[PDB]
Amino acid sequence: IEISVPIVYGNVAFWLGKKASEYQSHKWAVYVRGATNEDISVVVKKVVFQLHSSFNSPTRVIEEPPFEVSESGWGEFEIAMTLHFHSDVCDKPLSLYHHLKLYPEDESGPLTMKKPVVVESYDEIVFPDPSESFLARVQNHPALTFPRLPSGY
Amino acid sequence: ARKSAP
Numbered sequence: 303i304e305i306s307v308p309i310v311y312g313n314v315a316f317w318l319g320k321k322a323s324e325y326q327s328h329k330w331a332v333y334v335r336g337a338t339n340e341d342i343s344v345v346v347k348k349v350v351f352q353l354h355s356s357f358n359s360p361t362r363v364i365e366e367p368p369f370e371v372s373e374s375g376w377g378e379f380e381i382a383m384t385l386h387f388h389s390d391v392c393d394k395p396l397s398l399y400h401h402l403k404l405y406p407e408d409e410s411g412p413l414t415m416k417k418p419v420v421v422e423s424y425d426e427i428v429f430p431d432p433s434e435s436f437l438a439r440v441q442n443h444p445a446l447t448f449p450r451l452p453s454g455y
Numbered sequence: 456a457r458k459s460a461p
Contacts, residue, residue, distance in 0.1 A: 354458045379458035405461040 305429045305440065306447045307345055308337035311383060312422025315404045317415045318374075326374040328404045332381050333370035337424060340445035343367050345391045345427075352382040378402050385427075390436040392429055 311334040318327060334349055336342045349369040353360045354377070362371050383398040403421040406413060440446055
């Protein structure tokens with residue numbers, strides 16, 4: 303009787319072309335989402351993003367969907383995302399890590415620089431021992447996956 | 456932390 307949350311997390315990046323400057327070659331957004339875009343705030347209370355020290359206010363707290371930070375700049379670096387859950391879900395938070403990408407890597411064939419860069423990780427948060435009240439609040443929520451019920455027949 | 460242009 304476990305509850306799990308399929309998620310996707312990573313970033314999208316857009317090269318600015320003739321609008322690119324030394325300060326800002328790309329606009330990007332880093333995010334954690336439901337893998338099928340359902341509302342994971344059924345479990346996620348807030349997400350804390352840690353950006354590089356070169357940004358103003360490098361620790362951002364996003365309390366409401368969408369759980370994303372949108373920024374622009376010139377460089378790639380590691381982003382920490384700490385997921386804090388509602389109190390009936392889990393008293394421990396979960397940290398995720400994502401290397402921000404502004405260019406596509408590992409690419410055959412010809413590319414164009416204006417193509418949006420999407421680099422994201424597909425994953426699933428498992429809560430192994432859900433309380434009975436947590437179950438009653440979120441049962442069969444579209445963002446969650448539940449154990450298939452054995453046939454009584 | 457490390458930060459570099461691609």
